[PDB]
C-alpha cells in the first residue's frame, strides 16, 4: 500500500497526528513480527509512510508561518530566500541603480544617441 | 609533467649491495624500496618528457605555397597523372572535365550523383564505397575507424545548392575556385586529382 500525500493534505491537523500514531503502532508491531520471520518487506512501505506524514504535517505548519510573515521586514531566517551568501549580501537593484542628483541631470540632458552612418 | 615525480624517494647510496637509483622510502607496501624517477624505472618519469612547446605548425612562403597549388592544378589535366592516382577516368570524355554551370544549383543528392555519373564519375564513385576498410592501427579507436579512397573534387564558382547535395556522397569533395587547396589538389603529395569543373568555375580560373 503506502499513504499518499495529496490525500494527507485534505485530512485535518489532528487526523494527521492520529494517522501518525497509528502508523507507529503499526511499525512497532511489524518490528516484533520481523524477528520471528525470514523476511518482512512490508515494513518498508510503513516506514516510508511515516516519512510522508511527517513531511506533510511539517509542510502545512511551514506555509502557515511563511504566509503570516509574507510581506514584512524580518521573517525567520529559514524562510528568507537562501540563494548564496554573497548574493544574499549584494546590493539591491534599488541601492545599485542609485544615482547622484548631478549625475541624473547629465543622463537626461546628454543621453547616448541612436545614429547611423551613410548621409 | 608531474608524472614520475610524485615521490620523496632518495637513492640509498652505495654500500647496501644495490644500484643507486632513488628508492621509495617508508615501508609496509611493496612500493617502498622500488626504483624511482629514472627513465628505466617502472613508473619512472620518461626520458625527455614530451612538452607542448614542440613545433607543430610549419611556415611556408606564401609564393612558394602558390607555386605548389598551381603545379597541382596544372596537373589535374594530364590524364596520366590523374590515372596514376587511383581515379577511374579511363572512360570520361575529355580532361579537364568541365560540366554545365547548372551543376551548382542542384539541391538534391540523388540528382547530384546522377549528374556526376552522366559526366563520367561513375567508376570513381564506385571505387570509394568499394573501398571502405577498418583502419589497421590503434588509430581505429582514436576517432579514426574507417578508411577509404578519394573521390572526385567538384569545383564550382557559386554554391547554389551543390555543396549540400554532394556533401554526403563518399569521397566526393567540393571547393570554390577562389579558395582552391593543395591538400585536395594533390592528396598525399601525389599529383593528379580528378577535378570536375563547372564552366563558371573553369573561367573564373583566369
Amino acid at each position: 500500500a503506502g499513504v499518499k500525500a495529496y490525500e494527507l493534505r485534505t485530512k485535518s491537523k489532528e487526523q494527521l497526528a492520529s494517522q501518525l500514531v497509528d502508523l507507529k503502532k503499526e511499525l512497532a508491531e511489524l518490528k516484533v513480527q520481523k524477528l520471528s520471520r525470514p523476511s518482512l518487506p512490508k515494513i518498508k512501505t510503513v516506514r516510508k509512510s511515516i516519512a510522508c506524514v511527517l513531511t506533510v504535517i511539517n509542510e502545512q505548519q511551514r506555509e502557515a508561518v511563511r504566509q503570516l510573515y509574507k510581506g514584512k521586514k524580518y521573517q525567520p531566517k529559514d524562510l528568507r530566500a537562501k540563494k548564496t551568501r554573497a548574493l544574499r549580501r549584494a546590493l539591491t537593484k534599488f541601492e545599485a541603480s542609485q544615482v547622484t542628483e548631478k549625475q541624473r541631470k547629465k543622463q537626461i540632458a546628454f543621453p547616448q544617441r541612436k545614429y547611423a552612418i551613410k548621409a | 609533467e608531474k608524472a614520475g615525480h610524485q615521490t620523496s624517494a632518495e637513492s640509498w647510496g652505495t654500500g647496501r649491495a644495490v644500484a643507486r637509483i632513488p628508492r621509495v622510502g617508508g615501508g609496509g607496501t611493496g612500493r617502498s624500496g622500488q626504483g624511482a624517477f629514472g627513465n628505466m624505472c617502472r613508473g619512472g618519469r620518461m626520458f625527455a618528457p614530451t612538452k607542448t612547446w614542440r613545433k607543430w605548425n610549419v611556415k611556408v612562403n606564401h609564393n612558394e605555397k602558390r607555386y605548389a597549388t598551381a603545379s597541382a592544378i596544372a596537373a589535374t589535366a594530364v590524364a596520366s597523372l590523374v590515372l596514376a592516382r587511383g581515379h577511374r577516368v579511363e572512360k570520361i570524355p575529355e580532361i579537364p572535365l568541365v560540366v554545365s554551370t547548372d551543376l551548382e544549383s542542384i539541391q538534391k543528392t540523388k540528382e547530384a550523383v546522377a549528374a556526376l555519373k552522366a559526366v563520367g564519375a561513375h567508376s570513381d564513385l564506385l571505387k570509394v564505397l568499394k573501398s571502405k576498410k577498418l583502419r589497421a592501427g590503434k588509430g581505429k579507436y582514436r576517432n579514426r575507424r574507417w578508411t577509404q579512397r578519394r573521390g572526385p573534387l567538384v569545383v564550382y564558382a557559386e554554391d547554389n545548392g551543390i555543396v549540400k547535395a554532394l556533401r554526403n556522397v563518399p569521397g566526393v569533395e567540393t571547393a570554390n575556385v577562389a579558395s582552391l587547396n593543395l591538400l585536395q589538389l594533390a592528396p598525399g603529395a601525389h599529383l593528379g586529382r580528378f577535378v570536375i569543373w563547372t564552366e563558371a568555375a573553369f573561367t573564373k580560373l583566369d
Binding site: - | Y141, N143, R145, R167, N168
Partner: protein, 126 residues
C-alpha cells in the same frame, strides 16, 4: 556527417553514454520496429518496447518464434519473452534474453499514453 557543435562523434563518449544510460534512457534505446503490417496500420516505423507487446523474432536462432514480451530487462539491455526459453539439463527452464532490434512488434499493448505517443509521432492507429 555531424554538423552540430553539441553532438559528439567520440567513440569513448558514445560507449560511456550507452553503458551508463539511466533506466529512463534505456526505454527508448530498447525500441523495436513494427511489423510490416502494423506499420501501415498505425503509419509509424518503430517504438520503445514494453511488457505486453506481441512480437516476432526475425533474426537469430529463434528466428520465426513468437510470444508476449514478459519483461523489459532494462538492466541487462535485453527483452524476455514468455514462450522463448532454454530448456536446461536438469529440465529447469530459463529465459533467453532477446534484443528488441531483432524483434518486430505484432500487437501493441495500448494505453491512453501509448496512443498519445503513436499520435505524437505523426501516426494514426486503427
Amino acid at each position: 556527417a555531424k554538423q552540430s557543435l553539441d553532438v559528439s562523434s567520440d567513440r569513448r563518449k558514445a560507449r560511456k553514454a550507452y553503458f551508463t544510460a539511466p533506466s529512463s534512457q534505456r526505454r527508448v534505446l530498447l525500441s523495436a520496429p513494427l511489423s510490416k503490417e502494423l506499420r501501415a496500420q498505425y503509419g509509424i516505423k518503430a517504438l520503445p518496447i514494453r511488457r505486453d507487446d506481441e512480437v516476432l523474432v526475425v533474426r537469430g536462432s529463434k528466428k520465426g518464434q513468437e510470444g508476449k514480451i514478459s519483461s523489459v530487462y532494462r538492466l541487462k539491455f535485453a527483452v524476455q519473452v514468455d514462450k522463448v526459453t532454454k530448456e536446461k539439463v536438469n529440465g529447469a527452464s530459463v529465459p533467453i534474453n532477446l534484443h528488441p532490434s531483432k524483434l518486430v512488434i505484432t500487437k501493441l499493448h495500448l494505453d491512453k499514453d501509448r496512443k498519445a505517443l503513436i499520435q505524437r509521432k505523426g501516426g494514426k492507429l486503427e
